[PDB]
C-alpha cells in the first residue's frame, strides 16, 4: 500500500500564557556569549521552561507545577564562581527557589508580609526585593549560599500594593504601586535613612478609572527611571531631583513590561494593546541633551505581551517577548524596526504528552493531571483517568499489548491495569509502594513486565534493580548550569537501553550485566536518541541538527558521509527534531519528526554534493523524504505497515487594532 | 435513460443541438439539475445555448432558458473562467439580446391592465 | 393590496365620467404619483429576487445533495463512565 495518514486533531493540549522571561547572565556587549546563558520562561499554569538560545533556541529542561499553581515573576542569580540560582514568586506569600538539577523546589521561603506581587534581584545579587500586596517591600538576604535565605529588613510601609520593583544599584530600590505612584526607598545599609522611602512621584492619572504603574526600570547610563503605567503613557524620571523629564503617550492601554539594552540607547516597552514601542536615544545630540525620541513601533503579537526581556552580547543581540498568546517572539535589539523576527511555535515537544500503541490502534495523551485514551476505527474515546489525588503530571508509558499504563511525576508514580470491556475500559490501580515512593522522569518498558526507571536524583532502576553508572567530569559549565550532567533521554527495546545527558554524553547499557560501555563522543546538547536493531546502532541527533549513528556490541560510514551530505532542508531547518522512530514494515528505514515537519531518511543512500547565538562561543563546555504540510505538529508515530498517526493542535479576546478596511 | 443517452451523445464529441433536443425530450427538473451536476467539463454548451437564445429570445419553450438558468445557478464559478475570447462577445450579445425584455416589461404590464379593464367591464355590462 | 380592488372598480364602472373630465391627471394626481413610485422600482426588485433566488436554490440543491446525512450525523457524547473509573480519589473510596 501507499502511506495512509491519520491526521488527528483530537488532543487539545494547550500551554499557558508566558508571564515571565528572564536571562541568566547579564548583557556585557563587548565580551563573548557565555556558555551558561539560559533564558527562563515562566508560564501561567506554573511551569518554568529553560531554553538555550544556541542554534535556534532549543529547550533544555522543564520544571512543571501542579494544580492551581502559577508563576508571576522569576529572577536569576549568579554570583561569579557559584551555581546559577532561580527564584520565582507565584500568586502566594512565599518565594520559591528551585534547584536546577532535580526540577523541584529546594526552598519555599515564606516572606513575612502578605501576598507577593513582584520580585527583583539586587545588582551584585546578594539581596532580593519582594513587593507585596499590603504595601510592603521586603528584603531577603540571598548571599548565604544556594538554598539558605534569610529575612533582612522590611522597608517603610505604605497603603497601596507595590506592583513592580527595580534596584538602582546596591543602594536604592524603586517601586511602582497600584495607586498611580512610584516610590523610591533607600536599601543602602549603614546609612541614616535606611529603609525609609525617600521620594514619591505621581503619574498622570486616568480620567475615568484608577491608574496603576505596572512597570519600572532603572536606566544606568543616564540617571533615569523609565515607567509604564495603565494609561499607556511611558515616563522618564530623573532619579536625583526625583522628577519627570519627559512623558510619551505611547500605547492605547496598559504597559505591562518594559526593558532596555546595555548602554541604554533604547527602551522597549509593551502591554495589553499588543504593540512593542521603541524609544531611542542613540544620536550624539540625544545623548548630550538627554532626550529620548519615540522612534518606532511594531505589531507582532496576537493578544498581549506580558513579559519582555533583552540580551545583548558579542554574538547575540535580541529582545524576547511573550504574552497571552502562548508563543514566544524574538526580535533584534539594535535593529528592531529594520530587522527580522521569529515567532516560535507555541509548543515544541521536547517532552512528549502523547504516545500510541499499535495493538488496539490506541493512543494515550496526558495534559495537566488527567490522561485520556482513544482508539482508531473514525475514533472513539475509550477511557480517561482524571486522577485528582495527583496534583502535577509528567511522563507516561504504556505496556506493549496495551495492558498496564504507568504515569509518573517527580514526586511519585502510579501503575494502572487496563482491561478493554468493549466500548469502554476498566482501569484498576495495582499497588507498589516502591513505585509510590520513587521519583520518576522516564519509564520505558523493557518487557511486558520489566520497566526501567530514571529517577530525578540520577538513579536507574529496573523493576518488575540497579544499573551501575559511572561519573562525569565536573567542569565549570557543569558546576554553573547544574543540570547539564543529568539523564535527559533513555530509549530501550529488548534488554538493551541507552541514556543521554546533555553535556554531550550518550551511554549505552546492557540490561543484563548493567555496565556502561560509554560512547560519549559528542560536542553539544543531544536532541533525540533512537536505537536501530538493524545495523546494531544508536542514532543521536544534537542541537546543531546533525544525525550521528554509532555501533554497539565508532560512527559508521553511513554517518561519515551522511553528516556532510545532509540535505538543504536539514541545513536550513529551524525546529529541532524531537522524535525519531523506525519504520514498521522495514526494519532499517527510520522516520523522524520535529514540531513543524516530518522526514524520513534512507539507511543506505547518500546524496551528491555539487537571530541566534552566532559567535565563536562554544557549546555548554567552557530515497530521502521531507514534508511540512502538517506543521502545527505535536506527535507522530506508526500503527501498522502502511498507516501513520499525525496528532497535531488546533485553536480568545484581544485588543482590536484593526487592519485597514479596504 | 434518455438523459443518459443525451449525456453520452453530448459528452462524446458532437451533436450538441440534437443533444439539447434529447435533453428537451425527457426534460425533468431533477434530471435537468443532475445532468449539470454529473459532467466535469462542457464542450461550449454555453456557446451553443448562447447562440440559440440569441436567435430566439422569445420562444415558448422553456427548455433552453431553464437549462441556461440552472447552468448559471450551478456552474457560474467556472463559466466566467473557462474561456474569455469568444465567450466575452458571447455574453455581450446574449445580454444585449435579453435586455429588451427588461425594456418592454412595463408596456406589456400596461396592456395587461388595459385588457383586464376591457374584459371586466364587458363582463359587467352583460345586458341583465 | 386590499384598497386597490376599490380603485380598479372605480375606473371600470365610472369609465365615462373620468374620461369626460378635462384634466384626469391634474384631478387625481395623487393616484398617478403613488402608482408611479410603486411601479418605478420594479426592475430593481426584479434584479433583487433574481440574485436572491439564485443563491437560495443554489444552497437548497447543494444541501439537498446531502439532506439525509445530518439526520443521524450527531453522535456526540459526554463525560461517560470513564469519569467514574477516572476519579482516583473516588476509586480509593468507591
Amino acid at each position: 500500500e501507499r502511506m495512509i495518514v491519520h491526521r488527528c486533531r483530537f488532543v487539545d493540549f494547550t500551554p499557558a500564557t508566558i508571564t515571565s522571561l528572564a536571562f541568566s547572565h547579564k548583557s556585557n556587549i563587548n565580551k563573548l556569549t557565555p556558555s551558561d546563558l539560559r533564558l527562563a520562561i515562566g508560564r501561567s499554569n506554573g511551569n518554568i521552561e529553560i531554553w538555550n538560545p544556541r542554534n535556534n533556541w532549543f529547550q533544555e529542561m522543564v520544571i512543571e507545577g501542579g494544580k492551581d499553581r502559577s508563576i508571576e515573576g522569576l529572577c536569576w542569580s549568579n554570583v561569579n564562581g557559584e551555581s546559577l540560582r532561580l527564584f520565582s514568586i507565584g500568586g502566594s506569600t512565599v518565594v520559591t527557589e528551585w534547584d536546577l538539577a532535580t526540577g523541584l523546589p529546594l526552598r519555599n521561603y515564606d516572606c513575612n508580609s502578605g501576598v507577593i506581587w513582584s520580585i527583583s534581584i539586587n545588582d551584585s545579587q546578594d539581596k532580593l526585593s519582594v513587593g507585596c500586596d499590603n504595601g510592603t517591600v521586603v528584603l531577603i538576604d540571598i548571599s548565604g549560599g544556594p538554598g539558605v535565605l534569610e529575612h533582612d529588613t522590611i522597608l517603610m510601609r505604605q497603603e497601596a500594593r507595590v506592583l513592580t520593583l527595580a534596584w538602582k544599584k546596591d543602594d536604592f530600590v524603586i517601586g511602582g504601586c497600584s495607586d498611580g505612584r512610584i516610590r523610591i526607598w533607600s536599601a543602602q545599609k549603614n546609612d541614616e535613612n535606611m529603609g525609609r522611602l525617600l521620594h514619591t512621584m505621581k503619574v498622570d492619572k486616568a480620567k475615568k478609572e484608577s491608574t496603576l504603574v505596572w512597570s519600572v526600570i532603572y536606566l544606568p547610563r543616564t540617571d533615569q527611571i523609565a515607567s509604564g503605567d495603565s494609561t499607556g503613557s511611558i515616563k522618564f524620571w530623573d532619579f536625583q531631583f526625583a522628577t519627570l523629564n519627559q512623558s510619551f503617550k505611547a500605547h492605547d492601554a496598559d504597559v505591562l513590561c518594559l526593558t532596555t539594552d546595555t548602554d541604554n540607547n533604547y527602551v522597549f516597552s509593551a502591554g495589553v494593546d499588543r504593540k512593542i514601542f521603541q524609544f531611542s536615544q542613540n544620536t550624539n545630540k540625544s545623548q548630550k541633551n538627554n532626550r529620548w525620541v519615540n522612534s518606532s513601533n511594531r505589531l507582532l503579537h496576537g493578544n498581549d505581551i506580558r513579559a519582555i526581556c533583552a540580551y545583548q552580547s558579542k554574538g547575540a543581540d535580541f529582545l524576547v517577548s511573550g504574552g497571552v498568546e502562548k508563543t514566544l517572539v524574538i526580535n533584534s535589539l539594535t535593529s528592531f524596526s529594520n530587522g527580522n523576527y521569529r515567532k516560535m511555535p507555541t509548543v515544541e515537544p521536547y517532552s512528549k504528552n502523547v504516545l500510541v500503541n499499535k495493538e488496539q490502534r490506541l493512543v494515550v495523551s496526558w495534559s495537566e493531571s488527567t490522561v485520556k485514551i482513544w482508539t482508531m476505527g473514525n475514533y472513539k474515546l475509550v477511557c480517561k483517568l482524571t486522577l485528582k489525588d495527583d496534583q502535577n503530571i509528567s511522563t507516561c508509558s504504556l505496556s506493549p499489548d496495551g495492558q498496564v499504563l504507568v504515569v509518573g511525576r517527580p514526586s511519585t508514580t502510579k501503575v494502572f491495569h487496563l482491561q478493554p470491556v468493549g466500548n469502554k475500559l476498566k482501569v484498576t490501580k495495582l499497588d507498589n509502594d516502591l513505585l509510590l515512593r520513587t521519583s520518576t522522569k522516564l519509564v520505558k518498558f523493557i518487557d511486558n513486565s520489566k520497566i526501567v526507571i530514571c529517577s530525578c536524583e540520577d538513579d536507574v532502576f529496573i523493576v518488575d534493580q540497579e544499573v551501575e553508572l559511572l561519573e562525569v567530569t565536573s567542569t565549570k559549565s557543569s558546576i554553573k548550569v547544574p543540570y547539564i550532567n543529568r539523564i535527559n533521554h533513555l530509549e530501550v527495546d529488548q534488554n538493551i537501553a541507552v541514556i543521554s545527558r546533555g553535556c554531550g554524553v550518550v551511554d549505552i547499557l546492557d540490561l543484563k550485566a548493567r555496565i556502561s560501555k560509554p560512547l560519549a563522543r559528542l560536542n553539544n546538547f543531544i536532541t533525540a536518541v533512537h536505537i536501530n536493531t538493524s545495523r546494531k546502532s544508536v542514532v543521536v541527533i544534537t542541537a546543531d541538527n546533525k544525525i550521528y549513528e554509532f555501533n554497539m556490541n565508532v560512527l559508521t560510514q553511513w554517518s561519515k558521509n551522511n553528516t556532510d551530505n545532509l540535505p538543504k532542508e536539514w541545513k536550513t531547518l529551524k525546529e529541532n527534531c524531537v522524535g525519531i522512530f523506525s519504520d514498521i514494515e522495514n526494519s532499517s528505514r527510520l522516520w523522524f519528526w520535529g514540531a513543524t515537519w516530518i522526514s524520513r531518511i534512507d539507511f543506505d543512500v547518500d546524496f551528491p554534493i555539487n537571530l541566534t547565538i552566532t559567535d565563536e562561543s562554544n557549546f555548554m563546555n567552557d530515497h530521502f523524504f521531507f514534508t511540512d504540510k502538517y506543521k502545527p505538529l505535536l506527535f507522530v508515530d506508526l500503527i501498522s505497515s502502511n498507516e501513520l498517526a499525525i496528532i497535531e493542535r488546533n485553536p480568545q479576546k484581544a485588543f482590536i487594532q484593526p487592519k485597514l478596511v479596504f | 435513460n434518455i438523459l443518459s443517452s443525451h449525456l453520452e451523445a453530448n459528452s462524446t464529441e458532437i451533436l450538441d443541438d440534437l443533444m439539447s433536443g434529447s435533453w428537451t425530450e425527457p426534460e425533468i427538473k431533477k434530471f435537468i439539475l443532475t445532468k449539470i451536476n454529473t459532467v466535469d467539463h462542457l464542450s461550449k454548451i454555453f456557446l451553443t445555448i448562447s447562440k440559440s437564445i440569441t436567435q430566439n429570445p422569445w420562444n415558448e419553450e422553456n427548455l433552453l432558458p431553464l437549462w441556461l438558468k440552472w447552468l448559471l445557478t450551478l456552474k457560474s464559478g467556472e463559466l466566467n473562467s473557462i474561456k474569455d475570447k469568444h465567450t466575452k462577445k458571447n455574453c455581450k450579445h446574449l445580454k444585449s439580446a435579453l435586455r429588451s425584455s427588461e425594456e418592454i416589461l412595463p408596456v406589456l404590464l400596461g396592456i395587461q391592465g388595459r385588457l383586464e379593464m376591457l374584459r371586466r367591464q364587458a363582463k359587467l355590462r352583460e345586458d341583465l | 393590496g386590499p384598497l386597490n380592488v376599490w380603485v380598479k372598480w372605480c375606473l371600470i364602472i365610472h369609465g365615462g365620467y373620468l374620461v369626460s373630465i378635462p384634466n384626469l391627471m391634474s384631478t387625481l394626481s395623487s393616484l398617478h404619483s403613488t402608482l408611479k413610485r410603486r411601479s418605478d422600482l420594479l426592475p430593481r426588485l426584479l434584479a433583487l429576487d433574481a440574485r436572491l433566488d439564485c443563491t437560495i436554490n443554489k444552497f437548497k440543491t447543494l444541501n439537498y445533495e446531502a439532506g439525509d446525512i445530518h439526520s443521524s450525523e450527531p453522535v456526540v457524547e459526554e463525560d461517560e463512565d470513564d469519569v467514574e473509573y477516572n476519579e482516583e480519589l473516588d476509586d480509593a473510596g468507591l
Binding site: R2, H6, R7 | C91, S101, E102, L105, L108, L109 | -
Partner: peptide
Amino acid sequence: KQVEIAERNTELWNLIALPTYTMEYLDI
C-alpha cells in the same frame, strides 16, 4: 404568455473549513 416569457428572460438577464480528523495519502 408574453408577460410570462418576458419575466423569465428578464430573470435570465438579471441572472447573468477544516474537520477534526482526516485520512489522506502521501508518497512512499
